[PDB]
Design a protein around this ligand. Sequence first.
Ligand SMILES: CC(C)C[C@H](NP(=O)(O)O[C@@H]1O[C@@H](C)[C@H](O)[C@@H](O)[C@H]1O)C(=O)N[C@@H](Cc1c[nH]c2ccccc12)C(=O)O
Ligand SMILES: OCCN(CCO)CCO
Ligand SMILES: [Cl-]
Ligand SMILES: [Zn+2]
Length: 657
Amino acid sequence: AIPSGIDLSHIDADARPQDDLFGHVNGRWLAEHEIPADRATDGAFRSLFDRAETQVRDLIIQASQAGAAVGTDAQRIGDLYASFLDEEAVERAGVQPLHDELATIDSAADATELAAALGTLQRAGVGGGIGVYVDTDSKDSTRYLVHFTQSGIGLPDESYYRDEQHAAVLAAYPGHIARMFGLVYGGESRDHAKTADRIVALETKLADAHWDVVKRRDADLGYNLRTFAQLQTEGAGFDWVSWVTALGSAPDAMTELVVRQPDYLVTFASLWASVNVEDWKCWARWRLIRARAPWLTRALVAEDFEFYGRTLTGAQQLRDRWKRGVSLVENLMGDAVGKLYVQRHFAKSRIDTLVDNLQEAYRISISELDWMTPQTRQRALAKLNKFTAKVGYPIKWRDYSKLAIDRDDLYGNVQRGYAVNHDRELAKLFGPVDRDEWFMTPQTVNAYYNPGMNEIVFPAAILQPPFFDPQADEAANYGGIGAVIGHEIGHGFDDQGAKYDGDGNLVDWWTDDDRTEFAARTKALIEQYHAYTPRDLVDHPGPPHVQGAFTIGENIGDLGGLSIALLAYQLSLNGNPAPVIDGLTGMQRVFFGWAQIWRTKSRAAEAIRRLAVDPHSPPEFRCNGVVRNVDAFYQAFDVTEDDALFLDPQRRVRIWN
Ligand SMILES: CC(C)C[C@H](NP(=O)(O)O[C@@H]1O[C@@H](C)[C@H](O)[C@@H](O)[C@H]1O)C(=O)N[C@@H](Cc1c[nH]c2ccccc12)C(=O)O
Ligand SMILES: OCCN(CCO)CCO
Ligand SMILES: [Cl-]
Ligand SMILES: [Zn+2]
């Protein structure tokens, strides 16, 4: 027999799927599975992460004991690893490796020199007041541009500095900063209390200028093209020139650039002039101390974990030394690790067939969209036909020749590592656009849509059970990887993705009538998810609730994904009745497939963190919140007005479905 690909060993026979699909398919696991002490989240995704984490660790070791010549990626990976595991050597170095970079700050006599200092440090992986990256020009996908984004704060979001939901965390933050300073400088936390309070005051002024997560994902409000000269006039009070130079570039590197949040930029520059440089200096020390804390003493690592792990996320203990060594190798040389990973651990063909199926189902479904004009449908079909798919792994691999690794210098390795990756990013500006480039490693258990290249990408490691099983009946696969594929396609059509044409440029390809109706359906979905509270959070003050306006894009993805996966499945039967397996109809197994890939739970603190900063809906809602808008769900499970999940046909949302 062909296995069904649906796990039934964790079913909750007493949670009716009409009332609670998520609980029906996943209940026993939700009620019994203990989250490991070194984690805040466990489930499907973590299960595959862990498997891949071991394999990589083997590969680092199998590259380490290899006796490779100094100068090879085999050498860099091995010794960078060993940099980290020699806990003993790191311990005896104490707080000394922090000395030079910190003296960079302490030696700055005024605001001009502190901007220079900060540049240097940001180049070496330290956070600043402004985040910097290089992406394509929203209005011309044939050129790269530098983007400036809001930063400067030490908590997950701007909302931690005002909203009561986060007051406990906000109360504990100063205590922590003071503790860290005491470990770096000596004395006790009490001595460093004025320092902490001044730092928290400043971040709070910074948080005030920050756009929230809803406003922040508007592609339109986020596109603010400026010339370098306008940057200087508009945000006077900060030395752009010496800052940019220290980052490693020129008022010649790019004359145009993109400012994601103009009014933030202006308030940052202003506060740079008006606030005392010694306040700014304390803020800088804290940017550095935090950025460097995982590379130092046991005592600085533990205290960093107490706040950034236990208080923000509920995680109980530190990850074992070797887990953390693997992250280091991943952040700095992910592409090299990825080269070895795919020769060792990789049905690229059978994924291509599903992608094609989903693309065809989307094509058919857009063709019959009754709520919009023939006009915009056609344009919507043009976009979909310009889709590009990337499966498994990259064609080109990143060059690491400019990177030197010392087995007895972890700190140095980290610095050099962020500098080289930063230097590679800026060199992008001088050439044309890399369209063979990937933005995740093949060992990453996730997937993405890139608007600017109009492409969907699927790293090798997502092409595994429960998403994809080459041995299984296809229903589980359409419900898993099929829907994932649907979700990435749908991103190109969500409330923001739809603003980009097939060439990756911000253009309106709609009429106003079609925009209005589209906004109507968007509003209805926003309003639905605003009313959702995670079941593990029902008695919390508020209660906490899903941010319907933040999660919208993701929710459109999810709804398009699964509906169109169902359609594609029906079409693959060619008119034959779907095989019945393990008691379940073909359609029912697709929904169980969708439900089982969302098998995930989190500690209360991490769930609240996510409600704030994660544009994905909580898993229970990605499951239950999607299906109640899908008519096939009501057919599959005989759902009536008496069932919890029931929505009146008139209140169901239908967008690309
Ligand atoms: C449908 C799915 C299989 C892939 C899908 N990625 P996609 O939403 O296209 O895009 C993801 O989120 C975007 C906002 C980011 O910009 C991307 O980098 C990417 O992380 C997603 O829901 N990702 C979640 C799920 C997830 C992946 N790994 C996890 C580990 C723990 C918890 C959840 C996850 C996430 O990134 O968070
Ligand atoms: O992938 C980890 C989850 N992530 C979602 C955004 O992609 C949460 C933010 O830290
Ligand atoms: Cl360019
Ligand atoms: Zn998504």
